[PDB]
Structure formats: C-alpha cells, structure tokens
Design a protein around this ligand. Structure first.
Ligand SMILES: *[C@@H]1O[C@H](CO[C@H]2O[C@@H](C)[C@@H](O)[C@@H](O)[C@@H]2O)[C@@H](O[C@@H]2O[C@H](CO)[C@@H](O)[C@H](O)[C@H]2NC(C)=O)[C@H](O)[C@H]1NC(C)=O
Ligand SMILES: *[C@@H]1O[C@H](CO[C@H]2O[C@@H](C)[C@@H](O)[C@@H](O)[C@@H]2O)[C@@H](O[C@@H]2O[C@H](CO)[C@@H](O)[C@H](O)[C@H]2NC(C)=O)[C@H](O)[C@H]1NC(C)=O
Ligand SMILES: *[C@@H]1O[C@H](CO[C@@H]2O[C@@H](C)[C@@H](O)[C@@H](O)[C@@H]2O)[C@@H](O)[C@H](O)[C@H]1NC(C)=O
Ligand SMILES: CCN(CC)[C@H](C)CN1c2ccccc2Sc2ccccc21
Ligand SMILES: *[C@@H]1O[C@H](CO)[C@@H](O)[C@H](O)[C@H]1NC(C)=O
Ligand SMILES: *[C@@H]1O[C@H](CO)[C@@H](O)[C@H](O)[C@H]1NC(C)=O
Ligand SMILES: *[C@@H]1O[C@H](CO)[C@@H](O)[C@H](O)[C@H]1NC(C)=O
Ligand SMILES: [Cl-]
Ligand SMILES: [Cl-]
Ligand SMILES: [Cl-]
Ligand SMILES: [Cl-]
Ligand SMILES: [Cl-]
Ligand SMILES: [Cl-]
Ligand SMILES: [Cl-]
Ligand SMILES: [Zn+2]
Length: 526
C-alpha cells in the first residue's frame, strides 16, 4: 500500500485486528529535523522527496530524561520511551481503516508527560483498535519536550518558547494538507490528549494559529489553568539563565547564550534540566508553555475569562484518584509496596513537599478543610486526604473551572468522572483509579480478548470508544443503541456530569463542590 502525500510517496503496513485489517503508517516525517542551528527554533517546513518513504516502524522519540524510580517495575516503565532518543524525532503516525474510508473523521492524539517526557509509540496509545472498531482515522505526533521544546527567552526568535506546541501545530497542518489522500476528512478533526497533552489541547483552543486546524477537542485529566501547566515569564528566563550557568553558557549578549547552548550535545542539556528549579515538587514542570506573543498572545487566564477561544464543543473529564501517583515520588511514609498508612504529622510534612512556598496559615487551612472525617477512627484518613489534596488542587478543580468558563460562552460541554480501576493496574490498590489509567480504555485495549481484561471491562471500553467516536463525528458523546443513560450537557448552573464505571452509570451534579470552592476561590488569596 502506497499513498502520495504532497511531499512524496509513503508506504505503510497491513495489520490484522479483530478478524479484519487496519493499515498503519508509522514514522512519517512532518518537519525538517531540528538539528544544529535549528535547535530551540520553531519547526521548519519539510522538503520534497522523489522516492518512496517507508513508514513501517515507529520513529525516534524526542530527547528526554527517563523515570528510574522503580527499575523493572511495569507500572512506571510502561511510560518510558520505547524507541531510541534523538533530536531527529518530529514524526507522526496514521492508522487507516481497511478498506480505505471515503470521508472518515480524524482523531489526533497528543500525549502527556509533564511537558518533560512522552512519546507517541507507547503501547497504550496504539490507534489500530479505534480505526478497526469505529472506522475513524487516528493520528499521533512526537513533539519536543523539556528544554529542547520549551526553553524561552521571549521575543528572541533563536529561542522563543513553545516550540513543542508549534511542533504539534505543524502536525495538525500536515493532516489538513494530506489526510484526504488517506481517505480522511480535514473538516472533521478532533484533538484528544491526556495530562500535559490535554493542557496542550486546551492551549490550541486559545491559539489563533490553530483555530482552523481542528473541529472539536477532548481534554482528559488536564487543562491550561492547572497550576503546573503554564510557566510564568519570570520563571522562564530564570531557568534559562540557570541552565546556561550550569552548562558554562553564561554570556551577556542574550543571543550568544543560545549559540553556546546549541554547541552542547543533548545529553549535557538533559543532565542539567533538573536543577534549573531550586526547590521543586513532584509536579514540577521545568520547561513548559509560556506567553510568547506568538502561539500565546496573552495570559491564558485572561483569554479564557473574556471568551477569547475557539467556539466549539468540548469533552472534559478526570479520574477519581488523580493525586495518588505523585505521592510515591516524594511524600514521607508513602510506598508502592506497603499500604502507606501515614500519621497526622506525616500529612503535614506532605503538604510542605507539595506546597513549599505557601504560608504556614495556608497549609493549616488545607489541613482544616480536608480533615473533617466521617469515621474519626479510620487509619487511612490522612493517606487518602493527602491524595485528594494533590488531585483536587492539580487536576480536578482546574478542569471543572475550565469547563464552567468555556460553557458560559454558549458552547456544548460534557464532563465525565472516570472511577473504574483497571484489573491489570500494576500499582497497589490504595492508589485507586490513578492518573493516566483511563487511556487504555479510551484506546480500546480491553477489546482485545487475549489480554486478561474482564468481560465488564470490555463492555465499558466498548462504550467509551463509541462515545468518543460519536463526539468526534457528531459533537455528541452518546451511546445510543444499548439503552445507556444519556450524557447531559454541562451548564454552569446545575453542572451535570457522567460517571464511567463497570457497575453503574449515573448523572450527578457539582463534582467536589466544597473542595473546589476552597481551591478556586479562597486558596489563591493566601
Ligand atoms: C532564580 O535562580 C536563582 C539561581 O538559581 C540557582 O539555584 C540553585 C538552588 C541551583 O538550582 C542552581 O543551579 C541555580 O542556578 C535563584 O537563586 C537561588 O535561590 C535559592 C532558593 O531561594 C537559594 O537557596 C540560593 O542561595 C539562590 N542562589 C543565588 C545565587 O541567588 C533564585 O532564587 C531563582 N528565582 C526564583 C526561584 O524565583
Ligand atoms: C511504607 O514504606 C516506606 C518506605 O520504606 C522504604 O524503605 C524500606 C523500609 C523498604 O522495606 C520499603 O518499605 C521502602 O522502600 C516506609 O517509610 C520509611 O520508614 C523508615 C523508618 O525509619 C524511614 O527511615 C524511611 O525514611 C521511610 N521512607 C520513606 C520513603 O518515607 C513506611 O514506614 C512504610 N509504611 C508501612 C510499612 O506501613
Ligand atoms: C467530506 O465531507 C465534507 C463535509 O463534512 C462536514 O462538514 C461540517 C458540517 C463538519 O461538521 C464535518 O464534521 C462534516 O462531516 C464535504 O464538504 C466534502 O465534500 C466531503 N468530501 C468527500 C471526498 O466526500
Ligand atoms: C507518567 C509519569 N508520571 C508518574 C510515573 C509523572 C509523575 C507525570 N508527570 C511528569 C512526567 C515527567 C516529568 C515530570 C512530570 S511532573 C508532572 C506534572 C503534571 C502532570 C504530569 C507530570
Ligand atoms: C521499503 O519497503 C519495501 C518493501 O519492504 C522494500 O523492498 C524497500 O527496499 C524499502 N526501502 C528502503 C529500505 O529504502
Ligand atoms: C548580539 O550579537 C548579535 C549576533 O552577532 C548581534 O546581532 C547583536 O547586535 C548583538 N547585540 C548586542 C547588544 O551586543
Ligand atoms: C450493544 O450490545 C451488543 C450486544 O447486545 C454488543 O455486542 C455491542 O457491542 C453493544 N454496543 C456498544 C456500542 O456497546
Ligand atoms: Cl475545521
Ligand atoms: Cl514548577
Ligand atoms: Cl470520590
Ligand atoms: Cl497540630
Ligand atoms: Cl454548540
Ligand atoms: Cl447528585
Ligand atoms: Cl464529591
Ligand atoms: Zn503521563
């Protein structure tokens, strides 16, 4: 199979999925490799090739530091890159239904990873199931991360910031220019992503350069208004100068620092990325999105509040235990190999880890808001309270505030609460429905009967896959055939949302009302 793109011909592979066929094009280049003088620059356009490019294996992953907290443990290593790390990494993948569709809706995946890590070749991002079951086209791209993707001295085009975001944007442009040759519909394109990928998706709703490159958006466990998602412009320049100091690149003429950084090999950049922040947290984002005056014209909180974004439908949601994953990355008394019963004193030490520069009074009122027990005798009270603190503050409350503000401008919005713990989840039970472990259900991995998911998990995945595809195709995430409960629109007044679980599906209102009132209204003033 060979498809003529506008820059040259590409060859894919046939895959057998569920007694049928899916065609895969893995590793299509969409930009000139950002090497040499092109490091830290925005992505440049690709030049034509007259031969046939073989797109038959995942391409290199972008340079990044690997998680090594649990060597040999599948729970953490399933997120580590599974191809070689290289600066030559700006490639994308395309999954096509077989036979060739005539005008299929396109789903574009943007992976997360704190803007520091990530790759589209991960097993749980495999788009072949979605192409097979719902006959949509799935696209995913690799984008630069860390300093090589988000180092910023604003206004300076040698390192303007938001390069990884522009990588994503150029991939969206590739779909616009090429997807029809694959049988796809460039007028029906839905972005979806998780964590930092969901925050990227929400920034594409704000960026005018991206407004004509997609139709709808899905935000799983993330948004730009989350406290970890946007780097202040003070912080950006500090961490840039700190990295120059650590490497030996402190110049005075600010353009001369970047040329010094361009002569360091990528490994010396990666080794020093960690220490650009003096006192970080488990949720620290060393180099992330900034207000650059290009991709981002103003502070995103101002654009959201004043209705300056793409007007379209959105699907937003969170998991029940978003915070627990971060507790085994620094909190005292927590571990993946015990049950992590902590004391009140260990709870107070956890808050200092996650809220280092906050007043003594601020941590006291976090403790006060989250220690009104039902059962005063339960030993896991403080353990579960600290996870809820981290999850509410960093993910759930920002996502709800995002949806409320977005829908106030007349757009249909739908919110979900994912509360099923995967039967193949390798982390212990006390960590619950963790950050990132709805992804395998969205991509339809439990549909593979040869994988030891339960029968109920196959059913829930089949339902989620249909809702997601119906949202992309028709702007309405209903499962209309098997007498499901209807997913109601999220409005600022009643704030209805749908729960996703094996046992039951229910409509509820005002998720975490009391806790998010504290985080969104009171806490910013301490
Ligand atoms: C902006 O950065 C400076 C310099 O950052 C240094 O901090 C070290 C801890 C280390 O990471 C090194 O690589 C880096 O260059 C910050 O100054 C430092 O701030 C910390 C925390 O307050 C102090 O402990 C250090 O003594 C201090 N060093 C100096 C030379 O001033 C500065 O605070 C930072 N601005 C922020 C975080 O707003
Ligand atoms: C849950 O585990 C933590 C972590 O303890 C680590 O070190 C060994 C004890 C190992 O067996 C394994 O449990 C784990 O890798 C326990 O906290 C530790 O407690 C000791 C006791 O003095 C302290 O010295 C350590 O600093 C501390 N580690 C951390 C990360 O806080 C904790 O006691 C345990 N809880 C249980 C068993 O209920
Ligand atoms: C493919 O379909 C195009 C129309 O797509 C529709 O446009 C708007 C209303 C969006 O809501 C989108 O989701 C819809 O699917 C046609 O204009 C085009 O000619 C068609 N092309 C081919 C080759 O069939
Ligand atoms: C998949 C990796 N995940 C744990 C194994 C980490 C903690 C996620 N993470 C993350 C991942 C890589 C590097 C830094 C971070 S800080 C962060 C902030 C906001 C969302 C996610 C992240
Ligand atoms: C691309 O794939 C075809 C089919 O396997 C192969 O014969 C061809 O030689 C490949 N091109 C290369 C390796 O340049
Ligand atoms: C800094 O160096 C650049 C590159 O040579 C030059 O264009 C610019 O004028 C210099 N500016 C200052 C203030 O030295
Ligand atoms: C609806 O139910 C049938 C069995 O009655 C099942 O095979 C099918 O996959 C279900 N559809 C969805 C979208 O879940
Ligand atoms: Cl469009
Ligand atoms: Cl940070
Ligand atoms: Cl709950
Ligand atoms: Cl006390
Ligand atoms: Cl609408
Ligand atoms: Cl309710
Ligand atoms: Cl609640
Ligand atoms: Zn992740």
């Amino acid at each position: 199979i060979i498809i003529a793109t506008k820059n040259g011909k590409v060859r894919g592979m046939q895959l057998t999925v569920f007694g049928g066929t899916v065609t895969a094009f893995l590793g299509i280049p969409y930009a000139q490799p950002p090497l040499g003088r092109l490091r830290f620059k925005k992505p440049q356009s690709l030049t034509k090739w007259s031969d046939i490019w073989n797109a038959t294996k995942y391409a290199n992953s972008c340079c990044q530091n690997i998680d090594q907290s649990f060597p040999g443990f599948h729970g953490s290593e399933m997120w580590n890159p599974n191809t070689d790390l290289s600066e030559d990494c700006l490639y994308l993948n395309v999954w096509i239904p077989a036979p060739k569709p005539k005008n299929a809706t396109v789903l574009i995946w943007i992976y997360g990873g704190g803007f520091q890590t990530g790759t589209s070749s991960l097993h749980v991002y495999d788009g072949k199931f979605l192409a097979r079951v719902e006959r949509v086209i799935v696209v995913s791209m690799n984008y630069r991360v860390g300093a090589l993707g988000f180092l910023a001295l604003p206004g300076n085009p040698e390192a303007p910031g938001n390069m990884g975001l522009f990588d994503q944007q150029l991939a969206l442009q590739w779909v616009q220019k090429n997807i029809a040759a694959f049988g796809g519909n460039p007028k029906s394109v839905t972005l979806f992503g998780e964590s930092a990928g969901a925050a990227s998706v929400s920034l594409h709703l704000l960026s005018p350069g991206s407004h004509s490159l997609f139709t709808r958006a899905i935000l799983q466990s993330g948004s730009f208004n989350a406290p970890w998602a946007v780097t202040s412009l003070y912080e950006a320049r500090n961490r840039t100068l700190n990295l120059a100091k650590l490497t030996g690149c402190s110049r005075e003429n600010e353009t001369e620092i970047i040329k010094c950084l361009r002569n360091k090999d990528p490994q010396e950049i990666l080794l020093n990325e960690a220490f650009v922040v003096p006192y970080g947290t488990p949720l620290s984002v060393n180099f992330g999105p900034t207000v650059d005056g290009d991709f981002l014209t103003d502070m995103p909180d101002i654009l959201l509040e004043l209705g300056q974004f793409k007007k379209t439908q959105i699907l937003v949601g969170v998991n029940k235990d978003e915070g627990t994953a971060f507790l085994v990355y620094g909190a005292p008394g927590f571990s993946k190999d015990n049950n992590s019963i902590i004391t009140r004193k260990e709870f107070q030490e956890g808050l200092k880890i996650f809220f280092p520069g906050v007043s003594e009074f601020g941590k006291e009122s976090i403790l006060f808001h989250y220690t009104d027990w039902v059962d005063d005798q339960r030993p896991e009270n403080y353990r579960e309270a600290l996870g809820d603190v981290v999850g509410d503050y960093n993910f759930i409350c920002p996502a709800l505030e995002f949806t409320k503000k977005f829908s106030e401008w007349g757009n249909n919005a739908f919110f979900y609460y994912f509360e099923h713990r995967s039967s193949k989840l390798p982390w212990p039970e006390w960590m619950g429905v963790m950050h990132g472990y709805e992804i395998e259900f969205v991509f339809g991995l439990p549909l593979e009967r040869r994988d030891q998911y339960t029968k109920a998990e196959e059913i829930l995945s089949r339902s989620i896959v249909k809702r997601w595809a119906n949202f992309a195709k028709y702007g309405n995430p209903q499962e209309t055939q098997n007498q499901s409960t209807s997913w109601p629109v999220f409005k600022s007044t009643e704030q209805k949302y749908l729960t996703l679980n094996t046992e039951s599906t229910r409509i509820m209102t005002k998720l975490r009302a009391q806790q998010c009132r504290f985080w969104t209204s009171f806490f910013p003033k301490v």
